[PDB]
Chain A
């Protein structure tokens, strides 16, 4: 009953608008791997935009001024918050349902994560256009834990490779076992393929 989305290959605003709309409808949304987010335009454009945002601060007291979060997950969180009525109680309650993470944390490392084709770079962006990765942008503006995240993601990918190898073995054995006892399930298979299955 909770949406888990993989942030790799998704555009910032395109995914943020959809996530905010779903969150306002009472849906619980989890966004994972926020370093895979990419933004349209060359890297220098987005670097300059984030530096210009960094310049924004209260002259009399920067502590009370804007909070420039450097983590990619917090950057995505702020972009989503910009698309919500966060000043109202309803907006805050909706924003409480949102949850973002750098990398893929252990609570969600063993879950299937969905992707939104309406926010993917391969779909929404021309192949000849340039883009910038959110992880590299964050690392060059103050982020500290890019290498640790990369190492943990490599370990997680190795574990996922082991699990996927086991799944391949299980599926291959399942397919062979179906062939072994195909004579005892012929009547069950015929009715399945009569109504539009296994075809």
Chain B
């Protein structure tokens, strides 16, 4: 599985009806996937991992993207992880600060890949929950919980190094 700018999809599915069980129950899951085609595959993978259901023996009842309810508010997201290392698997809890839940999940994937060299296929997303300012364990998120937060830009290394390449003036880093 690859990763891009992930979107949250709600997928509802059930096993195909049979004369023994006329009305099978409906199951839903939260799947973060680049598109719906891979969202269905991830839903089937997780359902087969949990229930005795396969794609051939079941069907997808509803698949739809879940829009962010408050895209304009900054929120703290807690994500519970289940990934595989070179050694055995481990359980993790990570906190991220983003405007959207899908953005938080993308940040979680990027951070896991950067810090533990874990690919997307090895990572299972268990639960993503928005959290208030309190109940945050990671000081990195907590240090931004300040109404009177101040910080300058000390070392602004200039870009456009190849905009006109030869100049008589050396650049400036203090602004």
When distances are taken between beta carbons in the complex, the residues of chain B under 8 Å from A122 are 157, 170-171, 173
Quick one: which of B157, B158, B166, B173 contacts A116, CB cutoff 8 A?
B166
Number of residues from A at the complex interface, CB < 8 A:
16
Q: A112 CA to B167 CA in the complex, in Å?
A: 10
Minimum Cβ distance to chain B for residue A164 (Å): 14
By a CB distance below 8 angstroms, the chain A residues around B161 are: 117-118, 123-124
- Tell me the chain A residues, 87-128 only, with Cβ under 8 Å from chain B: 112-118, 120, 122-124, 127
Contact of A9 with B170 at beta-carbon distance under 8 Å, contacts A117-B158, A118-B161 already known: yes
Interface size class of B (residues with CB under 8 A): 10 to 19
B-chain residues with CB within 8 Å of residue A115 when the two chains form the complex: 166-170
> Which residues, 114 to 173 on A, are CB-close (under 8 Å) to B?
114-118, 120, 122-124, 127
Q: Which of A9, A112, A127 has the most CB of B within 10 A?
A: A127
Q: Does A3 contact B (CB under 8 A)?
A: yes
* Shortest distance between the CB of A19 and any CB in chain B (Å): 11
Closest Cβ of chain A to B87, distance in Å, is: 33
Q: How far is the CA of A9 from the CA of B171 in the complex (A)?
A: 12
**Which residue of the partner chain B has the closest CB to A119?**
B161
Binding site for A on B (CB under 8 A): 155, 157-158, 161-162, 165-171, 173
